[PDB]
Design a protein around this ligand. Structure first.
Ligand SMILES: Nc1ncnc2c1ncn2[C@@H]1O[C@H](COP(=O)(O)O[C@@H]2[C@H](O)[C@@H](COP(=O)(O)O[C@@H]3[C@H](O)[C@@H](COP(=O)(O)O)O[C@H]3n3cnc4c(N)ncnc43)O[C@H]2n2cnc3c(N)ncnc32)[C@@H](O)[C@H]1O
Ligand SMILES: Nc1ncnc2c1ncn2[C@@H]1O[C@H](COP(=O)(O)O[C@@H]2[C@H](O)[C@@H](COP(=O)(O)O[C@@H]3[C@H](O)[C@@H](COP(=O)(O)O)O[C@H]3n3cnc4c(N)ncnc43)O[C@H]2n2cnc3c(N)ncnc32)[C@@H](O)[C@H]1O
Ligand SMILES: CCN(CC)CCNC(=O)c1c(C)[nH]c(/C=C2\C(=O)Nc3ccc(F)cc32)c1C
Ligand SMILES: CCN(CC)CCNC(=O)c1c(C)[nH]c(/C=C2\C(=O)Nc3ccc(F)cc32)c1C
Lengths: 681, 684
């Protein structure tokens, strides 16, 4: 509280209240633990000399480093009051002391365009062509090495540039670790006049003009991109200027000037040796509606330049249209290449449609929103949280053209509805449906993960589910999604739609989803072809917020083989074989319940099989399981060949003859020790 | 060469045109790609001569190209009045708009073609026509801009004034977004033109409380442009709202303090702006804006913070909380601070730091924007977004001087994770963990190859584990497209071979150690035959490599002990094993001819009680057939009441048979591998 009242006192500039507390014994070398600021640092930054004098009297160290290694002296450079620098100098060890990023009081004077402070530190030993020496991590990626000249040029301080080159002997062609010099820094400044004046000075002193800036750009290309005839004339006054220099992507200064629709700057560039076979400049002027520059371009023809098409799309369905999109010219919206044409449309939506696009040269689906849209905001928000969810469509990023939020997504081959259509004629009519389990377990996982992330979908339907080239399934179209904390029992709608999607997929897409939405709970249950489906759906309409991942353990997701295996394994328990009425197993399998389909099972199994196996089977469940166990073990032996052919495939046999069997056993053993007989799930 | 010989219209010479106009080619021959006719293209190049020559030859002036554009509309662009005069008698409506809403008048407005604009106005043209677009564009609230808005946007001072005064233009016309010409005016690059057009519009009474992109007012657009003049011009209106906020809830003043604009900030305070919209003092103070600090203190942020963001990371949690709290400027969508507190690791380039990217926690790998290595990384991550066991790529941001590569944040390295979990298994118990880690890596590298890439540096430091124990492959700065150099795939597969031993040995043998060993020494280091066999397949993948990785997932190494045992039991239940039928297919596969394997004389290697009790009938023989028979029989009966003594001697039978006979599983695997009996193997 003491030094804290001092800290406060200084911030207020109560000179007296400071005096009292210094005499009370308060530490002027106190530093707050976050950013390392001292009362001496603070007094300098706010520029009240009285406080700096008062604190220096009380032993406040002027070489005291804050978090960034800056000392109150360094800070005075930024402040630019000369009598502060006077007051701190007779305690300063080195005038060239740097913070951890290599900054000196002189650099700081240059950065803040403080002429008078620069003069003071000039006459006092301050090195003028000191490069910033930074920490090892910054150097290894070639950061640092900049100078007061480069600093002054970037900030556009005409005064400071004049004074350094002339009065102060600044090296004009000094390089930072990136290989940049003050000219590059000069050319980046937003103001026209300031940029003009600084470039002039620097050129006349012998700044190299053949230098690489950000994006491998020359000074010339920077002058072009800025649309400044003035900055381009100065740079084209020198002969050694490489006019046919290429930036990162192979764009030339001329190419750029045609592309930007800048007549004068293009012509001046031609009259100076900008070679014309760097791209079809004529066509570029033509799409620009630049009549005048066209003619001039055809008045220097060197024949008729030509352009090789390499890029192959990954998509099969969208391939040819993506080739076309890659071929034609479009302007970019950040990292996105897009064209609002029917040829490129994927689908129609509640706002804006979905089109093919290219994002960093990768194929994408692009969902469009009005940039103000609640709906677009909900989508982007949910997608940004879903990056770890493996069964959610991959999110590339979102780009704004100012009136339209573009959401870019991985491109998929088909919607679930399409996919089921294309694969409808693959399976023999009674085959086991492995495909349905895969699709639906991927959905359970996707929705389960979406819930754990705090989001609910609200519009699960088959058009929002996509299938990729490799048969994987993904969830999509988040516009109507909500953070479920807002209303926790709205999760229910996801769970109910998932129940409808169970039926949908098990029915191989033959029943439309519309139909299934107009049906009531009991109609849906009745529409189900088996008991596992019925029970699964039931559990979705009547849930217990991690129920979904537990439902992946449900016998619906057991293969026919696994189901058969579980019945055989249960039927091999000692107490089923010895018919121990005492035992815990037969206790559990013994209930109350309604009429089963295996009650008096012995009368509905072929009479030939019945005899051969009795070679004492009662109408208990226990004796059915045992029957399954023995038949499983012996079905393949020579002496059962006639039995084998009556049965056919045994898994199919038992499940068909007794549809409720697997479910009944699963229900009875679910939370018990003999749950260990279930497949590894 | 009949329709493709119109380039002359390109080469613009009248001679070849007239001459081929009666040699055979359709005047209205629209090129297929965009709908450009010789009439379209002539009007665009402004050849007074070609429009005459072609209009002589019937060519329709109402003929639409791809975007719905008659050469009339295109004369509004070129601006020439006597092209518009040659065409006007052969057009139904002068106000005929292409598919995006654009009349010949708006094209005159867009390109600042002043004489053309006059000519169209007296000939009936529409000055308060909003653009009518297709329904796709309307549903997302695009279109409905007037010619006035086009003129303000392009900054044509001529055109605005003519329109406002001569042409009765509605100043406070809105587009579908809800934006007047004023909004368009302030987004102009040119300060002077912007000043001029603001003035004209403001004095005709354009709304100054409108909203543009990002919910920004005109005032906020003025402040973000850093232009005192436009700020004064707008504050000249009495009705204006100073305390209007953008989407992010920033007031115009807040923005001025933030941007180090003492003068505009002082001005906005003098015109009644609220000083309690942010901690304004602290903002000026960090900006080193001494005078403005004084000023706001003389008036302050007394009646003003916000507080709930929770990281998902447990390891990096506390530091992510710190990073969220502190103020940083953005590098695009990324929040980062280069300091030891936030540092995850050192690299050969720049280190890995914690970051926030669209408010999501991330690891940020740093490269000089120059870097070949950074380019290789971004490239390979861009092709891997579908690969589920590659670290998620969020995006890359540039500082001008540095490439930030942002990645999903993981808890641990593979090396760390194996250390932390070294205590977890009783050392005589099945290693589930190893199979999971290694199957994810097979999947990762498999898919990485399918995408055309090879890693080149697979080691445990490049493999990361997340909060839910998913394993992810990272670090592609040394990756290569293998198409150029097809056999360098084999080096990744060798590294996988090393990683197999590393992971099975639970991290006890260091990777360095293992990289110095020869292929044969590594195989010798293997604690079992499944590992031995697996690794072998990785060091010798084959020239015809292809998807060697995907077939290896089927190998007994990835079978649980439960499933190995289940397979041996199932094989043992074959009728020809039970009848000991020597002629049969199964026994021919298992056991042909006349034995070096640890199951030679297997009857003499199991406890004599078990052997004796089991003989409850030809007593059990030293054939493998009879061993599988033994395992099936034991499997079935081990838990029966009367076999309680056997059960305790054996313990868990899977563990037993594997231990007493280490080569058994592999031996059966090898014999049944591409046979019908493969159906007894587990599922994958
Ligand atoms: N003689 C020839 N021989 C062989 N090929 C040729 C020839 N001549 C040209 N080509 C090839 O044609 C290709 C481009 O097609 P195009 O020039 O025929 O028509 C353009 C484009 O495809 C098509 C694409 O539009 P877009 O999807 O990008 O969508 C643009 C935008 O989103 C929307 C603006 O509306 P708003 O939101 O602002 O209300 O409309 C479009 N637009 C913008 N400014 C426009 C304007 N001033 N006037 C009319 N429409 C404008 O529209 C034409 N176009 C684009 N920018 C334009 C502009 N600034 N002024 C006038 N027309 C423009 C070119 O790529 C070129 O290769
Ligand atoms: N009186 C006070 N009392 C108590 N607390 C206070 C007080 N005043 C401010 N605070 C609080 O402290 C926090 C930290 O503020 P700070 O100024 O101590 O430290 C900043 C940052 O931590 C720290 C690291 O910043 P960074 O990682 O963004 O790194 C910036 C850059 O990447 C790096 C190298 O740049 P270069 O070599 O490539 O050009 O140095 C930083 N830098 C840039 N310009 C600088 C300059 N002119 N001078 C010194 N450093 C500069 O440096 C301080 N800083 C940043 N920009 C600055 C600039 N333009 N001028 C002066 N200092 C600057 C502030 O955020 C604030 O909340
Ligand atoms: C088969 C006939 N169809 C009528 C039902 C017409 C085809 N059109 C359709 O059904 C259709 C619909 C309604 N959506 C899509 C595609 C996507 C979607 O919605 N979100 C996405 C996100 C990413 C992506 F890469 C594709 C999509 C199609 C093909
Ligand atoms: C002894 C452990 N120390 C703290 C207790 C920390 C030391 N740090 C270490 O060992 C270490 C190393 C050498 N790499 C990582 C992490 C990553 C890496 O290399 N690429 C990535 C890409 C993404 C990502 F999300 C994390 C990483 C750590 C934590």
């Amino acid at each position: 509280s003491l030094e804290e009242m001092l800290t406060q006192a200084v911030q207020e500039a109560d000179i007296e209240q400071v005096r009292q507390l210094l005499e009370r014994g308060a530490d002027a070398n106190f530093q707050e633990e976050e950013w390392g600021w001292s009362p001496l640092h603070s007094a300098v930054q706010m520029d009240s000399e009285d406080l700096v004098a008062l604190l220096l009297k009380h032993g406040a160290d002027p070489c005291l480093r804050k978090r960034n290694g800056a000392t109150p002296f360094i800070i005075a450079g930024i402040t630019g009051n000369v009598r502060l620098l006077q007051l701190l100098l007779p305690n300063v060890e080195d005038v060239n002391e740097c913070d951890v990023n290599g900054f000196t009081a002189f650099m700081e004077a240059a950065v803040y365009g403080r002429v008078e402070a620069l003069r003071f530190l000039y006459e006092n030993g301050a090195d003028v062509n000191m490069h910033r020496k930074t920490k090892q991590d910054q150097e290894r990626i070639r950061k640092g090495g900049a100078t007061a000249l480069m600093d002054a040029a970037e900030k556009g301080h005409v005064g400071v540039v004049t004074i350094l080159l002339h009065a102060m002997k600044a090296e004009v062609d000094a390089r930072d670790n990136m290989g940049r010099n003050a000219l590059v820094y000069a050319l980046l400044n937003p103001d026209d006049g300031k940029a003009k004046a600084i470039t002039r000075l620097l050129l006349d002193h012998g700044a190299d003009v053949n230098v690489r800036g950000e994006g491998s750009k020359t000074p010339l290309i920077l002058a072009v991109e800025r649309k400044n005839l003035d900055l381009v004339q100065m740079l084209l006054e020198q002969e050694q200027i490489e006019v046919n220099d290429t930036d990162r992507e192979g764009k030339t200064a001329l190419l750029l000037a045609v592309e930007l629709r800048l007549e004068e700057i293009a012509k001046l560039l031609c009259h100076r040796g900008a070679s014309t076979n760097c791209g079809d400049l004529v066509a570029i002027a033509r799409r620009n509606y630049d009549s005048d520059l066209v003619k001039f371009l055809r008045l220097h023809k060197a024949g008729d330049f030509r352009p090789a098409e390499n890029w192959k799309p990954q998509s099969s369905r969208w391939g040819e249209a993506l080739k076309h999109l890659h071929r034609i010219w479009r302007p970019m919206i950040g990292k996105l290449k897009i064209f609002i044409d029917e040829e490129y449309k994927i689908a129609d939506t509640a706002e804006g449609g979905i089109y093919l696009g290219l994002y960093e040269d990768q194929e994408v689906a692009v969902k469009r929103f009005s940039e103000g849209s609640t709906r677009g905001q909900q989508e982007v928000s949910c997608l940004q949280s879903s990056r770890a969810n493996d069964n959610v469509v991959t999110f590339y990023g979102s780009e704004s053209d100012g009136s339209c939020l573009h959401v870019c997504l991985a491109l998929c081959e088909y919607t679930l509805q399409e996919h089921l259509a294309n694969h409808r004629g693959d399976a023999v009519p009674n085959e086991e449906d492995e495909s349905a389990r895969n699709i639906l377990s991927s959905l359970f996982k996707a929705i389960g993960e979406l819930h754990r992330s705090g989001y609910s979908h609200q519009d699960l339907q088959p058009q929002n589910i996509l299938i990729d080239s490799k048969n994987g399934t993904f969830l999509a179209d988040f516009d109507k999604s909500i953070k479920w904390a807002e209303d926790p029992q709205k999760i229910k709608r996801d769970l109910e739609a998932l129940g409808l999607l169970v039926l949908y997929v098990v029915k191989k897409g033959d029943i439309s989803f519309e139909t299934l939405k107009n049906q009531s709970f009991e109609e849906v249950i009745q529409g189900s072809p088996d008991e596992e489906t019925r029970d699964l759906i039931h559990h979705l309409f009547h849930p217990g917020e991690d129920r979904l991942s537990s439902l992946l353990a449900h016998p619906f997701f057991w293969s026919w083989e696994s189901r058969y295996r579980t019945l055989r394994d249960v039927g091999n328990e000692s107490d089923i074989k010895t018919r121990n009425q005492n035992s815990r197993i037969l206790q559990l399998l013994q209930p109350s319940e309604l009429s089963t389909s295996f009650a008096q099972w012995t009368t509905k199994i072929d009479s030939f099989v019945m005899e051969e196996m009795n070679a004492l089977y009662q109408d208990t469940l226990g004796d059915l399981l045992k029957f399954i166990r023995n038949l499983g073990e012996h079905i393949n032996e020579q002496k059962n060949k006639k039995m084998k052919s009556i049965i056919g495939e045994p898994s199919q046999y038992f499940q068909e003859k007794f549809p409720d069997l697997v479910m009944y056993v699963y229900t009875k053993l679910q939370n018990t020790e003999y749950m260990k007989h279930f497949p590894k799930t």
